[PDB]
Design a binder for these strands. Structure first.
Ligand SMILES: [Mg+2]
Ligand SMILES: [Mg+2]
Ligand SMILES: [Mg+2]
Ligand SMILES: [Mg+2]
Ligand SMILES: [Mg+2]
Ligand SMILES: [Mg+2]
Ligand SMILES: [Mg+2]
Ligand SMILES: [Mg+2]
Ligand SMILES: [Mg+2]
Ligand SMILES: [Mg+2]
Ligand SMILES: [Mg+2]
Ligand SMILES: [Mg+2]
Ligand SMILES: [Mg+2]
Ligand SMILES: [Mg+2]
Ligand SMILES: [Mg+2]
Ligand SMILES: [Mg+2]
Ligand SMILES: [Mg+2]
Ligand SMILES: [Mg+2]
Ligand SMILES: [Mg+2]
Ligand SMILES: [Mg+2]
Ligand SMILES: [Mg+2]
Ligand SMILES: [Mg+2]
Ligand SMILES: [Mg+2]
Ligand SMILES: [Mg+2]
Ligand SMILES: [Mg+2]
Ligand SMILES: [Mg+2]
Ligand SMILES: [Mg+2]
Ligand SMILES: [Mg+2]
Ligand SMILES: [Mg+2]
Ligand SMILES: [Mg+2]
Ligand SMILES: [Mg+2]
Ligand SMILES: [Mg+2]
Ligand SMILES: [Mg+2]
Ligand SMILES: [Mg+2]
Ligand SMILES: [Mg+2]
Ligand SMILES: [Mg+2]
Ligand SMILES: [Mg+2]
Ligand SMILES: [Mg+2]
Ligand SMILES: [Mg+2]
Ligand SMILES: [Mg+2]
Ligand SMILES: [Mg+2]
Ligand SMILES: [Mg+2]
Ligand SMILES: [Mg+2]
Ligand SMILES: [Mg+2]
Ligand SMILES: [Mg+2]
Lengths: 259, 46
RNA sequence: GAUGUCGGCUCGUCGCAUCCUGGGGCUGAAGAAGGUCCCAAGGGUUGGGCUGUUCGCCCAUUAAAGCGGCACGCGAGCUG
RNA sequence: GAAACUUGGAUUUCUAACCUGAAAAAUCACUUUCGGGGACCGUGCUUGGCGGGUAGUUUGACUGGGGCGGUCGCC
RNA sequence: AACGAUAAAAGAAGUGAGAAUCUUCUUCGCCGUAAGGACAAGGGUUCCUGGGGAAGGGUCGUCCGCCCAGGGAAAGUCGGGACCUAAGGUGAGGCCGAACGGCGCAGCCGAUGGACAGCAGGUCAAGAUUCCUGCACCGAUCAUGUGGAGUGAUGGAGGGACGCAUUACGCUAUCCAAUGCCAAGCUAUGGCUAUGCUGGUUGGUACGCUCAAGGGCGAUCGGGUCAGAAAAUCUACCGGUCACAUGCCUCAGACGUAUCGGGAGCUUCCUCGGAAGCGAAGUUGGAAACGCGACGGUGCCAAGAAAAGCUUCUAAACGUUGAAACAUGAUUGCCCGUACCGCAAACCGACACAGGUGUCCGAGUGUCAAUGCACUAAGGCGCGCGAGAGAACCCUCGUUAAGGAACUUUGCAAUCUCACCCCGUAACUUCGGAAGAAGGGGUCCCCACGCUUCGCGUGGGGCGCAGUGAAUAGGCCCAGGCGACUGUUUACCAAAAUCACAGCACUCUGCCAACACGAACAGUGGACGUAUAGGGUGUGACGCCUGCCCGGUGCCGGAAGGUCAAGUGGAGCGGUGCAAGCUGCGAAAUGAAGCCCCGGUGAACGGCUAAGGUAGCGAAAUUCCUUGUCGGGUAAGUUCCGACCUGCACGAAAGGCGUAACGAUCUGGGCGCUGUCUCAACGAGGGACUCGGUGAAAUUGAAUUGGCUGUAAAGAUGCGGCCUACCCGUAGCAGGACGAAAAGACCCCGUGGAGCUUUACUAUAGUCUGGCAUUGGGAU
RNA sequence: CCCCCGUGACAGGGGGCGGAGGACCGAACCGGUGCCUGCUGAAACAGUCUCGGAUGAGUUGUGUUUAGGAGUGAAAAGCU
RNA sequence: GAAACGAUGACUGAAUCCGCGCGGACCACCGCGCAAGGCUAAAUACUCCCAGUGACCGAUAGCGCAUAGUACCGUGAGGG
């Protein structure tokens, strides 16, 4: 769903369940000491951080009930505020179809039902999960985003195959946790973003094409009128395919990375 | 015609200060150098 | 260790290889109207459209709408 | 032709190096209960490769101005 | 030349050696969303008093922000500190590093923010929630009485706690009206005789059964331990019983009563002008915040600090007999700032500078509204040369016959238009717009009737050339080019058609991610993000759309082979020694990533031999010839529109062709108006001129510095010849003095420089790769 | 959101109401479009007139952080 | 370079007295020395300061200063 109109815009999103409740402050910044390292990003409106439970282990064997499903900035992911029988309230990112006031059990013996958050060896094949723990313990580095999913494929010994959103297949051992279902935030992607400055509500001041800069500034800089040569960034690497990975440990846990 | 100098005591003193020259040794060099230039006068008193 | 460049505007001034006017000779000049050559520099030699344009083409006129010089006259005068 | 005191190589795998995460102790430190990775990675020395990302420089003369064209020695 | 804004002065009185300039008086003019007032910065005695007059002051000076001396600055409650924390800074241990040093958990520093006890008045020449007077408030220690018991941690909790827009109700600040009150007196000019005119018309505290909008409020019993390290009576949850109207709770503020203030003025001595005393009434009606009641209500996405004080709970501890708590006096109250300037003569601008400087207050009348606009209160000010003159010229203005853009690069500039109400309004459209299209009417006064109010509606009457009667105040339209759009950019010649922009595409990156800062197996940014994410690159809303060519360059993929380094390794070759031996060059094999080799790749570099332009457009921001050819407009059209096509040298994301809207964009046209023009005139003001005061600058070989013509280094006052020409100034003009300015920026030269580029040379950060260590065991 | 009409390949349309906007006119403020003036200036970049933004990609104070092959840059080789 | 010798960053890793290193590829011979442990006056350099002296200055000289790192310029280093 979206808003639609005339007066010069397109497509805002729409949300239920509103609270404004309980976690740490965050503070915007771009440069890191001297010259800005991660480029642009100097704008933005005043976000706060929400501590979110990726690990979800020590709550093992303990059921919970969804309080509400809340909007969080810095996210693109619906978050469900969980409350446990323990009394402990914990923010857990909300998947598609996860209702308000549903009940989500934690722990390994919990059924592959929505949100139930179990390890892979107990997850029946083909099933869809999100928030995938990479190395047992720690937390989920995989599929934390909107509409992003992972599909379990037949395991090995302690190890399982998974199809990540990129399409790449990964070896990930079954000792790792995961959450059942895919994390929607509906379809975030088709938001229109309207006009500029909206891109500025959040990140800041997007691409400055090197081709308008000067020979001193960028490789693309210089000349008379709009043109090209080369094909390359801040430093001469290029737009198109150059494998940027280094030959490494991880690389033996990847089977058919394609796209 | 907003000019360059905007007197601000705290600024002036927090850059340029005796304390501020203590912070570093390029500073401490300045200090000894000046002491040597003959009793000059110094950074905070001005 | 600088003589500011095109064109316009302003202001003129000079040469005559005379566009007009004046005086003549010849005419394949009856008259009227011309052609051409000589004498002649006093004065006069219009207003617009196009173009940065000088030039040039066009409009409407005129006795005629001359050609050139003056640092392609003139920016310690203007424009730009 | 078997046995071994054996030596290097590729494979495979292992845990005591090492890396790395959680745990009451925000970075560390730890007896640590552990978990994953792992002789890899990293790292130091060397070998060859790439490298306007950066750096130092080079880019002649004659010439009825310079350039272009041409011409530099020899008979 | 100038004396620093064209806001403006005049007279009298005074002081004095001397007055246009200092003082007093009375007028005038100027500001008044300030040119008034209050802070913060910053500046330092610039404040006040008494002197002074060199210099500073653009003149003058008796005067000053100047010089001399003397005084003035007062805090438990305001702001800061003994309180807290943000970004950032620092940082024991800790992590890195040729040195110096770079990082970094806790902790500590750091207001721009959180927390926190006072208000009303009075007055020194100069201070004021600071002193004084009135009543008040906070904490702390002690003392008396109650109580007669628990208190409550470097620890838990709750709380502090946070956005934007818009908006209901009730106030107050505060302003307005009056035949309300109060107070003073007069009045004349023609009138009025008060119903006129002028002024004032309440601030704090306490009490109170009075009026009162609005504001927010649940409570205990209890269950699980897996929750807050443990604890806990506390907090989260879960469950049970009493929260559908109530209603406990709170008063903004009003009202009353009292009290302390204040109040117009009146009195009184006056030592040249103040001081002391006295003290009138406070009414009805209306307007009203951005302040208060509040942490109100509603909607929205872009999702809106932390920590301490604060409240609650225990651990430990002391005591449970003298507790905590209350109030009753008492005692106690540290440090710093506090004058004055503070949109400016006191701060930044070299200056007493037309510049700049964050916040708060900022009255009245008229005006739909308002911080606009005119005038004006309070308050402040006439800008520290002045006086005449009424030439040229210049600047800033007012009016202009007839004409009306003929001016000219161009309507540049300057008119015209101008608010509000009504009627009315196009092609085209993305259905919002275009649009304030265009156009037409209205507008003042009085009276009458009507409504819903500041007022409006209707009718009639009136007055002037004119009724947004003055000030504020859009000219419009038709076509194109470019970019869609709001926006951004060359501080000081370029605001655009540049840049960015949502949207689109290619590609990279699986998380100690790619990428980037960096002595660094440190740390950090990416990101407390995880492929619907992040980096890079190019296009550039939306609409249809995006063709052919990979031979070369790159990038991705490939393995049969061609070469390929060290290196493990040593046949062989040669030296020396009598000799064992010791030694020099050093190869076949083993050798990786590269490169040659193959295949793919274009919203990759790219091209129209690898192919040769698919749409669509075309003399175009691309066009040479060229003012192309026809046509439109014009009396006349190198520009402009339309075709056509012969495209010198358009073309599909360095996008192709369109597109409503947008534009201080560029181009052509038309309407209107008009000093732009025919072609200029008159008028104003401020300079120019004259007199008195103060008094610069660039420049300058020296000068007793003419014309013609000729010569001369080839543009003569300075040489020749001839002509002209008494001495010296003032106002003016701009031809010469190759006039001034800056050792030409163009050009060339220098085996001069620097920025940039790349398939120029050479290295190199980075990065790839074999071997060697760190580096171990077991199987085949 | 609340009323009425309407759904034949068609969407909607009207009234109430609401209070949206890189909306509009316009002071403050931010900005510099065009002319003139100034040009040994009042001023080492202004003045008058005119013009742009004017709830946003907005303006502004304080505190801090980033710099010499370096920073910063809605991109001029601009600023430091 | 025919490059010995010393010196380390990486990697290997010896002998020891009929032993070891050197004598400028290397070998034999002949000589010279005994590393991988330490400490150590004097002659040597300098002039903030003090003394004496001068074919050194004498007020645009001599230190920048006949005293001043002051006045003054700058945010600052700095300059003067
Ligand atoms: Mg550029
Ligand atoms: Mg480059
Ligand atoms: Mg380029
Ligand atoms: Mg000269
Ligand atoms: Mg003749
Ligand atoms: Mg000529
Ligand atoms: Mg000429
Ligand atoms: Mg020009
Ligand atoms: Mg170079
Ligand atoms: Mg004068
Ligand atoms: Mg003056
Ligand atoms: Mg005074
Ligand atoms: Mg004097
Ligand atoms: Mg004087
Ligand atoms: Mg009255
Ligand atoms: Mg009378
Ligand atoms: Mg009255
Ligand atoms: Mg004061
Ligand atoms: Mg001033
Ligand atoms: Mg300002
Ligand atoms: Mg007001
Ligand atoms: Mg007003
Ligand atoms: Mg005004
Ligand atoms: Mg005068
Ligand atoms: Mg006229
Ligand atoms: Mg008349
Ligand atoms: Mg007329
Ligand atoms: Mg003309
Ligand atoms: Mg105009
Ligand atoms: Mg009449
Ligand atoms: Mg106007
Ligand atoms: Mg634009
Ligand atoms: Mg500029
Ligand atoms: Mg400009
Ligand atoms: Mg614009
Ligand atoms: Mg005079
Ligand atoms: Mg002579
Ligand atoms: Mg002569
Ligand atoms: Mg002149
Ligand atoms: Mg000259
Ligand atoms: Mg020169
Ligand atoms: Mg707007
Ligand atoms: Mg050696
Ligand atoms: Mg002397
Ligand atoms: Mg001297």
């Amino acid at each position: 769903r979206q808003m639609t109109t005339a007066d010069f815009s397109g497509l805002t999103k729409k949300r239920p369940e509103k609270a404004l409740t309980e976690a740490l402050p965050k503070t915007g910044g771009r440069n890191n000491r001297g010259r800005i390292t991660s480029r642009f990003i100097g704008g933005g409106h005043k976000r706060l951080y929400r501590i979110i439970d990726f690990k979800r282990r020590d709550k093992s064997g303990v059921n919970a009930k969804v309080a509400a499903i809340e909007y969080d900035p810095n996210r693109s992911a619906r978050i469900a505020l969980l409350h446990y029988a323990d009394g402990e309230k914990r923010y857990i990112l909300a998947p598609e179809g996860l209702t308000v006031g549903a009940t989500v059990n934690a722990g390994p013996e919990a059924e592959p039902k929505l949100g139930n958050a179990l390890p892979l060896r107990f997850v029946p094949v083909g099933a869809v999960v999100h928030a995938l723990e990479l190395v047992p313990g720690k937390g989920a580095q995989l599929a934390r985003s909107a509409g992003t999913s992972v599909q379990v494929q037949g395991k090995e010994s302690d190890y399982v195959i998974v199809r990540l959103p990129s399409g790449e297949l990964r070896r990930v051992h079954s000792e790792c946790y995961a959450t059942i279902g895919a994390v929607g935030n509906a379809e975030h992607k088709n938001i229109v973003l309207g006009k500029a400055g909206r891109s500025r509500w959040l990140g800041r001041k997007p691409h400055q094409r090197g081709s308008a800069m000067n020979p001193v500034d960028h490789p693309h800089g210089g000349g008379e009128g709009r043109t090209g040569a080369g094909r390359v960034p801040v430093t001469p690497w290029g737009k198109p395919t150059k494998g940027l990975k280094t030959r490494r440990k991880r690389k033996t846990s990847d089977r058919f990375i394609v796209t | 015609m907003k000019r360059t100098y905007q007197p601000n005591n705290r600024k002036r003193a927090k850059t340029h200060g005796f304390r501020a020259r203590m912070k570093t040794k390029s500073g401490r060099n300045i200090l000894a150098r000046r002491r040597a230039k003959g009793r000059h006068q110094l950074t905070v008193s001005d």
